[PDB]
Design a protein around this ligand. Structure first.
Ligand SMILES: *[C@@H]1O[C@H](CO)[C@@H](O[C@@H]2O[C@H](CO)[C@@H](O[C@@H]3O[C@H](CO)[C@@H](O)[C@H](O[C@H]4O[C@H](CO)[C@@H](O)[C@H](O)[C@@H]4O[C@H]4O[C@H](CO)[C@@H](O)[C@H](O)[C@@H]4O)[C@@H]3O)[C@H](O)[C@H]2NC(C)=O)[C@H](O)[C@H]1NC(C)=O
Ligand SMILES: *[C@@H]1O[C@H](CO)[C@@H](O[C@@H]2O[C@H](CO)[C@@H](O)[C@H](O)[C@H]2NC(C)=O)[C@H](O)[C@H]1NC(C)=O
Ligand SMILES: *[C@@H]1O[C@H](CO)[C@@H](O[C@@H]2O[C@H](CO)[C@@H](O)[C@H](O)[C@H]2NC(C)=O)[C@H](O)[C@H]1NC(C)=O
Ligand SMILES: *[C@@H]1O[C@H](CO)[C@@H](O[C@@H]2O[C@H](CO)[C@@H](O)[C@H](O)[C@H]2NC(C)=O)[C@H](O)[C@H]1NC(C)=O
Ligand SMILES: *[C@@H]1O[C@H](CO)[C@@H](O[C@@H]2O[C@H](CO)[C@@H](O)[C@H](O)[C@H]2NC(C)=O)[C@H](O)[C@H]1NC(C)=O
Ligand SMILES: *[C@@H]1O[C@H](CO)[C@@H](O[C@@H]2O[C@H](CO)[C@@H](O)[C@H](O)[C@H]2NC(C)=O)[C@H](O)[C@H]1NC(C)=O
Ligand SMILES: *[C@@H]1O[C@H](CO)[C@@H](O[C@@H]2O[C@H](CO)[C@@H](O)[C@H](O)[C@H]2NC(C)=O)[C@H](O)[C@H]1NC(C)=O
Ligand SMILES: *[C@@H]1O[C@H](CO)[C@@H](O[C@@H]2O[C@H](CO)[C@@H](O)[C@H](O)[C@H]2NC(C)=O)[C@H](O)[C@H]1NC(C)=O
Ligand SMILES: *[C@@H]1O[C@H](CO)[C@@H](O[C@@H]2O[C@H](CO)[C@@H](O)[C@H](O)[C@H]2NC(C)=O)[C@H](O)[C@H]1NC(C)=O
Ligand SMILES: *[C@@H]1O[C@H](CO)[C@@H](O[C@@H]2O[C@H](CO)[C@@H](O)[C@H](O)[C@H]2NC(C)=O)[C@H](O)[C@H]1NC(C)=O
Ligand SMILES: *[C@@H]1O[C@H](CO)[C@@H](O)[C@H](O)[C@H]1NC(C)=O
Ligand SMILES: *[C@@H]1O[C@H](CO)[C@@H](O)[C@H](O)[C@H]1NC(C)=O
Ligand SMILES: *[C@@H]1O[C@H](CO)[C@@H](O)[C@H](O)[C@H]1NC(C)=O
Ligand SMILES: *[C@@H]1O[C@H](CO)[C@@H](O)[C@H](O)[C@H]1NC(C)=O
Ligand SMILES: *[C@@H]1O[C@H](CO)[C@@H](O)[C@H](O)[C@H]1NC(C)=O
Ligand SMILES: *[C@@H]1O[C@H](CO)[C@@H](O)[C@H](O)[C@H]1NC(C)=O
Ligand SMILES: *[C@@H]1O[C@H](CO)[C@@H](O)[C@H](O)[C@H]1NC(C)=O
Ligand SMILES: *[C@@H]1O[C@H](CO)[C@@H](O)[C@H](O)[C@H]1NC(C)=O
Ligand SMILES: *[C@@H]1O[C@H](CO)[C@@H](O)[C@H](O)[C@H]1NC(C)=O
Ligand SMILES: *[C@@H]1O[C@H](CO)[C@@H](O)[C@H](O)[C@H]1NC(C)=O
Lengths: 441, 48, 48
């Protein structure tokens, strides 16, 4: 005695987890914003009441899409640049000993070599100042990348500065944002909203320290796909940024050598004045209190009476064993030994100085056979950044001892994107629905 | 037997079998491949 | 330019001059260096 019939409803607010291709939006640069949709002056956020959604930062396809887009943009920006195939020549290198400190012992090589000119039948004897990490002995030396692939000198006019990027979904798709503070990136989120696209995310390439990122608005956040598994990288998000001041104080000189028709190689001529190591400075008290916050947050996961130890990176490439980043076109690799060096037991104005080594030959992503040569930057360089998080790895894990050791980690830039896209997911709207109603056609 | 125009000798005749004929093709030389670095990240594979 | 000789070691009567042992100069990873190498080419692949 029901006499119910099918009734079709179009425009129903129902969605399903889906993977699609988000497009860029933003307000010469490597991150090509000239192909991005203009961002709306007043973006609209729809706050969904009574909606609880399942989120998982460690299986988000947005991270993979961002990784692919960033790699593609990096490749695109380098295509219309000079290829330094002639640079693979025998180098007559001597030690740069004019006005050097004891920490720059043999770190710079004054290398003279023959080079091609615009005329095919003429050669020019030139010289350049290379870094010890960029050359390898065969007094005779050759560039490190010569036995793997030819390097592409980045065009100098293109800037490496991160620019915020918004990832907006196509029609029929929505971006659900988890507004729940204290959210650890996985599980039900009861405070949900719909956004045309996220906040402006800057693609900051850094290892062992998340830089110029977002800050937790409540407290330090510890996130891990499986915290009990030591193989999983722990993402730490700060609530108070730690100011870091990184400088190369050498007054570098950039000379230009015509290596062919319309092709210029930018060499380091001579350093004006004293030569001393590039470095970074981090406030000691701020770092200590941030580490205390991280320790008391980790105690929730690893017990209240455990010993929390911070030590050096285990080993590997220079990219991962050191805080690797870019500061105004020059690629720094900083020995973060004064930061993660302490033990914590449950119970003024100086700063930690991290020495840094500069590199010109760069393999940014974990790829072999695709290298980039950074042209030298004219003059001293200084840059100030916010440390907003960490990429830690837990050492050991056996139950014999009651101490937990965390070491800096990185290498894979997907984690860097994951720390910004943790509170976002993509869904596809299913407007069609069928329901029972007493109405009959 | 198939042909666009069988009477025209210029047209190729396509013959399709019903019983395949097994053919065994071999190069019995124990060739040695060596690699010569001809440039940065470029290898030429020669017969040693 | 290839300096080619006849491959005559342990060859049959049906392989008379079918393989050429050719030595030549070649580029290396370093632009200012050359390497003397050799390879076994086929008679159909080289011309005097
Ligand atoms: C985190 O964010 C902070 C703040 O945004 C970042 O710190 C800023 O970093 C930028 C870039 O390093 C820096 O801007 C530079 O300031 C210099 C001093 O004023 C300028 O000289 C420099 O301009 C040159 O470079 C630009 C490209 O980078 C060119 O567009 C410009 O024309 C200049 O280029 C000329 O001069 C150079 C040098 O002589 C020469 O080689 C060229 O051929 C050309 O002749 C930049 O504008 C900010 O000053 C920094 N701000 C602060 C507060 O520190 C920090 O880097 C971010 N962290 C990370 C990891 O990204
Ligand atoms: C690197 O080497 C070059 C050449 O070996 C040096 O250039 C010479 O500088 C002196 C001055 O001290 C001049 O008298 C010479 O004529 C220069 N030679 C050439 C070919 O330019 C250069 O000074 C060295 N730089 C460093 C930092 O050691
Ligand atoms: C640039 O090329 C010249 C010429 O090839 C080099 O000078 C030669 O050096 C070799 C030793 O390696 C000598 O046997 C030759 O007699 C030299 N010839 C001349 C004309 O000088 C020179 O050494 C090269 N420079 C660099 C930096 O590699
Ligand atoms: C480093 O962190 C400080 C503090 O979080 C940032 O200063 C804030 O900048 C925003 C601009 O978007 C302002 O709205 C806030 O009022 C500022 N707060 C304070 C306390 O100054 C600073 O911009 C950050 N710098 C970088 C490079 O990320
Ligand atoms: C990092 O800190 C060091 C000190 O630990 C700074 O070195 C001082 O720099 C000032 C320049 O303003 C000089 O006047 C002092 O003589 C230096 N002292 C020492 C002991 O080196 C360094 O300048 C700081 N660098 C940055 C980028 O902040
Ligand atoms: C972390 O600290 C340890 C020691 O405190 C460093 O080990 C040193 O490594 C250098 C280079 O291999 C050696 O010359 C020293 O003798 C080592 N010291 C000791 C006490 O063994 C380790 O290199 C540091 N980690 C990083 C990434 O720099
Ligand atoms: C990072 O810094 C630490 C601290 O200076 C380095 O460890 C030092 O290594 C030297 C070897 O040149 C030893 O003489 C010191 O005794 C070590 N000090 C300590 C406290 O262990 C470490 O080698 C640096 N990392 C790299 C890769 O050089
Ligand atoms: C093709 O046929 C010839 C003979 O018709 C084969 O030559 C024989 O190969 C076997 C190897 O199993 C030897 O034991 C004989 O001594 C060979 N006899 C002669 C006269 O050559 C040849 O192996 C066959 N090849 C293939 C690929 O089937
Ligand atoms: C092709 O020619 C090369 C060189 O002309 C031969 O290599 C030589 O082999 C002999 C052994 O019989 C060695 O003593 C020489 O030192 C080798 N020379 C070089 C430059 O490698 C090679 O054996 C020849 N191969 C054939 C099939 O004829
Ligand atoms: C590789 O190059 C060298 C040098 O160009 C060649 O040796 C020369 O051969 C010519 C004859 O063609 C002589 O006139 C020269 O005197 C030789 N010079 C030297 C330094 O040996 C050699 O023949 C080349 N090899 C091949 C296989 O072509
Ligand atoms: C250059 O200096 C380094 C370290 O001081 C030393 O190992 C090397 O032998 C020196 N090379 C010279 C003097 O050619
Ligand atoms: C290039 O040379 C370095 C040191 O000379 C070596 O470690 C590396 O394995 C070499 N790479 C290749 C592809 O030969
Ligand atoms: C923190 O992550 C764990 C991982 O399983 C999850 O069970 C828990 O619900 C998360 N925290 C909150 C407050 O949801
Ligand atoms: C986490 O990793 C441990 C091994 O270290 C494993 O026993 C456990 O089942 C994992 N947990 C999940 C939820 O996968
Ligand atoms: C670097 O050297 C140039 C040329 O002598 C000079 O004009 C400039 O002021 C110097 N800069 C610094 C920071 O010493
Ligand atoms: C970094 O530089 C700023 C000035 O730009 C200064 O106020 C701050 O104290 C410095 N911090 C450190 C740790 O050197
Ligand atoms: C690490 O801390 C210890 C104090 O236990 C100190 O002796 C050592 O010099 C520190 N090392 C660095 C690189 O700061
Ligand atoms: C086939 O070829 C013959 C010879 O050229 C010609 O006479 C005949 O018309 C052709 N048949 C057809 C269907 O075109
Ligand atoms: C070819 O030569 C290699 C090296 O001498 C040997 O290991 C292999 O067994 C040989 N193969 C044949 C089919 O003779
Ligand atoms: C190599 O052999 C072929 C055929 O046997 C012959 O025509 C040619 O003249 C020979 N070349 C030599 C011996 O240089």
């Amino acid at each position: 005695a029901e006499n119910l019939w099918v009734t079709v409803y179009y425009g129903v607010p129902v969605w399903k987890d889906a993977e699609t291709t988000l497009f860029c939006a933003s307000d010469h640069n490597v991150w090509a914003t000239h192909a991005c949709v203009p961002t709306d002056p007043n973006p609209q956020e729809i706050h969904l009441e009574n909606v609880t959604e399942e989120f998982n930062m460690w299986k988000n396809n947005m991270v993979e899409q961002m990784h692919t887009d960033i790699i593609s943009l990096w490749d695109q920006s380098l295509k219309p640049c000079v290829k330094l195939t002639p640079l693979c020549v025998t180098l007559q290198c001597t030690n740069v000993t004019n006005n050097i400190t004891d920490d720059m012992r043999g770190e710079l090589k004054n290398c003279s070599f023959n080079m091609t000119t615009e005329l095919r039948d003429k050669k020019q004897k030139v010289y350049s100042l290379f870094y010890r990490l960029d050359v390898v002995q065969i007094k005779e030396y050759r560039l490190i990348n010569c036995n793997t692939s030819a390097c592409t000198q980045a065009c100098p006019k293109v800037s490496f500065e991160p620019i915020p990027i918004h990832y907006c979904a196509p029609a029929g798709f929505a971006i659900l944002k988890c507004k729940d503070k204290k959210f650890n990136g996985t599980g039900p989120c009861p405070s949900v909203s719909t956004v045309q696209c996220t906040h402006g995310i800057k693609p900051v390439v850094s290892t062992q320290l998340l830089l110029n990122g977002s800050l937790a608005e409540e407290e330090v956040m510890i996130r891990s796909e499986n915290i009990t598994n030591n193989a999983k990288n722990i993402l730490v998000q700060f609530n108070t940024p730690v100011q870091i001041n990184c400088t190369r104080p050498n007054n570098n000189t950039r000379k230009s050598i015509r290596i062919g028709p319309g092709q210029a190689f930018y060499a380091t001529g001579d350093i004006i004045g004293d030569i001393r190591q590039a470095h970074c400075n981090v406030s000691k008290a701020t770092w200590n209190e941030t580490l205390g916050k991280v320790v008391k947050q980790l105690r929730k996961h690893f017990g209240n009476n455990t010993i929390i130890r911070f030590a050096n990176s285990s080993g590997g490439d220079l990219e991962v064993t050191t805080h690797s980043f870019n500061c105004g076109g020059e690629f720094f690799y900083c020995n973060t030994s004064g930061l993660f060096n302490s033990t914590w037991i449950s119970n003024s104005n100086d700063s930690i100085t991290l020495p840094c080594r500069i590199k010109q030959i760069i393999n940014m992503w974990q790829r072999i056979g695709q290298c980039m040569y950074a042209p030298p930057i004219q003059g001293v360089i200084r840059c100030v950044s916010n440390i907003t998080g960490l990429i830690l790895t837990r050492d050991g894990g056996s139950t014999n001892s009651t101490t937990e050791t965390f070491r800096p980690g990185g290498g894979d830039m997907r984690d860097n994107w994951r720390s910004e896209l943790y509170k976002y997911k993509v869904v596809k709207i299913e407007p069609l629905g069928v329901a029972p109603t007493r109405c009959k056609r």
